[PDB]
Amino acid sequence: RHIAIPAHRGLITDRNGEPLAVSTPVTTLWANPKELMTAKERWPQLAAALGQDTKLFADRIEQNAEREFIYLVRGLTPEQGEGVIALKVPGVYSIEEFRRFYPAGEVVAHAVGFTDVDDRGREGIELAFDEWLAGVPGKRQVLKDRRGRVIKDVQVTKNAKPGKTLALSIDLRLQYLAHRELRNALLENGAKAGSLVIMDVKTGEILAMTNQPTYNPNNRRNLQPAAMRNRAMIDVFEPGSTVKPFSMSAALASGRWKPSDIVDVYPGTLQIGRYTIRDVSRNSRQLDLTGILIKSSNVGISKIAFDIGAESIYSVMQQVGLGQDTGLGFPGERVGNLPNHRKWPKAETATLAYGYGLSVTAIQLAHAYAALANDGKSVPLSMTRVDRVPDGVQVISPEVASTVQGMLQQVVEAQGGVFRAQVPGYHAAGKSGTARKVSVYRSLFAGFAPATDPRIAMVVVIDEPSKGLVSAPVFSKVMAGALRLMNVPPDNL
Predict the structure, then answer these.
(1) In this structure, which of 125, 276, 466, 488 has its CB flanked by the most CB atoms within 10 Å?
(2) What is the number of other CB atoms lying within 10 angstroms of the CB of residue 27?
(3) Which CATH number is 2-167's, of 3.90.1310.10, 3.40.30.10, 3.30.200.20, 2.40.50.100?
(4) Is 281 part of the annotated catalytic residue set?
(5) Quick check: 308 and 297 in contact, CB under 8 A?
(6) Is there a contact between 123 and 217 (Cβ–Cβ < 8 Å)?
(7) Which is catalytic among the residues 23, 169, 195, 241?
(8) Nearest CA to 369 among 450, 294, 447, 461?
(9) CATH code 3.30.565.10 for 172-215+234-485
(10) Phi, psi of 458, rounded to the nearest 5 degrees
(11) Distance between CA 375 and CA 367 in Å, rounded?
């Protein structure tokens, strides 16, 4: 008959060459039952080396004595298979298969994914590039002589073609750092889940994408689906104040607003017909445009939104990628939602402006802050190593981008700003947020550094630390280590 020859699945490395998924050869054992039936006295020794019960093994050989080929076991270790082969039992033959091994384990479990018992990809990169990584299986022909004995020198009908190598955009050094500090932030704040994304704002490469809780892809025998979800690409949420800078970009591009314009926010609430907009910091009477970001004033950005109209705000969000398909082709990836109505009443205009009228993923939010950090130039996302700068698209003018960049640095360094997120030795820009979802609380921070010449954008999501500024220190530590890892010279002395 015919026996398939499994193809060596292509190697997955990080951007530097660190192995992330390796096809390790294993030993699979198959038997010719008619040949096995002539050496019954060896079956107990055989079943022991295979790791099978003596009687169950004997039953299986009898019930399949008619066939010329059955599998005894698949995927033994090299030493185990050599134990079986050392018995020299008639009718027992071996083939070399491959088992996928993930050296980093749970650190990069969601990005890389994992494979079948048949070594085809089921999640992550392993599934998104499965065509690329799989290769073609070969065919071996079982030749029997007279009296049904398999010929030792097997006959290969068709050769297997190996799969192709893939280098991800992930940087394993930054992946470890992000996986570590995010893991600490949850066990310290007693949080349920979380996510952390790091992007190269110039290349669009994804330098790290870690989720908690995670799982070990080498030990899936008790895998729980709560750890298998790639939250960075699947969990959608209302971005809240983290998309206020993109409302600000619309206001500065309208020509009707300058950073020094004041807006009346007395008394921290605002009545829009039957709805009531509420600022958290109601102890403010008037704010300029930077202060509206510093204080997360829903009232402040709503009055600006009424002036410039929602379609201009919708346009900046759409063009920085929010609610749009990322093009990564990852399985289970969610596009989120940007609201679609032709006419924009005041309440819909307001909620969109302060980030409650839309749904985004953490990956989209990092992509949006990368465009802002890249001087308003949008570059496509990439999970594979880019062979250097791709063509970007100017979606925010460089001067409006520089102005909002400066405002976001003021969110971190100015009076009343979030001093938590400061990277010691560096100038960091960023914006915090909070997302609530009702069914009948996520801490958000998004930023980039160094603000004098941005290199990387980061988004930190931390699920349910209370029944929320817990993400800001996570940004601080990871951004510090990341800059100190990929060697960014300080800009704050």
Answers:
(1) 125
(2) 21
(3) 3.90.1310.10
(4) no
(5) no
(6) no
(7) 241
(8) 447
(9) no
(10) -140, 140
(11) 13
